[PDB]
Amino acid sequence: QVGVAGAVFDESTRKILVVQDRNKLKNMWKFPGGLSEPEEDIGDTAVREVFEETGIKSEFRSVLSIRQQHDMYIICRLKPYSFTINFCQEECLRCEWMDLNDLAKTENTTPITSRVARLLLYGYREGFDKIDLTVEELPAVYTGLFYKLYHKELPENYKTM
Amino acid sequence: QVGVAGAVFDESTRKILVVQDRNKLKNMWKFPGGLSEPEEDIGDTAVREVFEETGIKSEFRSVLSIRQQHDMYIICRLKPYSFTINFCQEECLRCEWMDLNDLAKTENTTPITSRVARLLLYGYREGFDKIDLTVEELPAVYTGLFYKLYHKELPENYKTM
């Protein structure tokens, strides 16, 4: 099943919600995330994983990045609507609203997390339209399968011609 | 191995290079594509698959879309620098420089191809910066693995802070 992470950014305070895992890379700040359940939309996985790890209630806004290895892991931009952290003590050592600029500069994070922080900063300064991507389900033609398609948000007048 | 497609768009003529497979969906226009070889960068797969199917020489410019099923298939924007079609007769029935607006409107294509045509039209009218994404290799921290990360192009001053 696909993994999904939530990058919960408060555009009013310039804060980004991050965690340190209790038992894995406990000194590296990361975004909360985990595995989708069967039938779960990507955005719902993000919002659920965030809430379970951090106590923060949020809304899906966009996809920010797709991570591919040898399979897929989707990192999403979320907008918080609660702000009191109640983190999962079995899973996390720390959970903070960190200054986004601090995450973008720290060495105590992963290269992917840092890249996604820098991308958030670019959207914070120059507009989220610069960075946001959508995910949509589209049908196959040759078979009865379905795909998920990730791309820059396409204005409604073009999606439909 | 990942699949990769090439959407070869001539911004000077508003034409998009498309094929009909000789033996599969022979009435549906599609972008040339196929499987990456071991060690091959995504862009090189695109350029090679295009050349092998169509005779057209091109250069990678960006990623346009990521297609996910139950694994990954990357659709790239390419810029042609040769224009004489010499298609692979064993593989394709037709290969044409089609008007992009015609591809964006036709029923004789797939929903994904049509979506990517509409996204190209949006870039043709409003700038390719609106649609282009990059792919880069970034390292893991927990293990010795590497990932590929797909996201909107991030200006150099931010990538590096």
Curated annotation (Swiss-Prot), chains A, B:
It comes from the Eukaryota. Its EC number is 3.6.1.-. GO terms for molecular function: ADP-ribose diphosphatase activity; NAD binding; NADH pyrophosphatase activity. GO terms for biological process: negative regulation of cell cycle; negative regulation of cell population proliferation. Disulfide bonds: none annotated. It is found in: Cytoplasm; Nucleus; Mitochondrion. GO terms for cellular component: cytoplasm; mitochondrion; nucleus. Residues 1-122 form the Nudix hydrolase domain. A motif (Nudix box) lies at residues 34-55. Belongs to the Nudix hydrolase family. May contribute to the regulation of cell proliferation. Monomer and homodimer. This protein is coded from a FGF2 (BFGF) gene antisense transcript. This is Nucleoside diphosphate-linked moiety X motif 6. The gene is NUDT6.
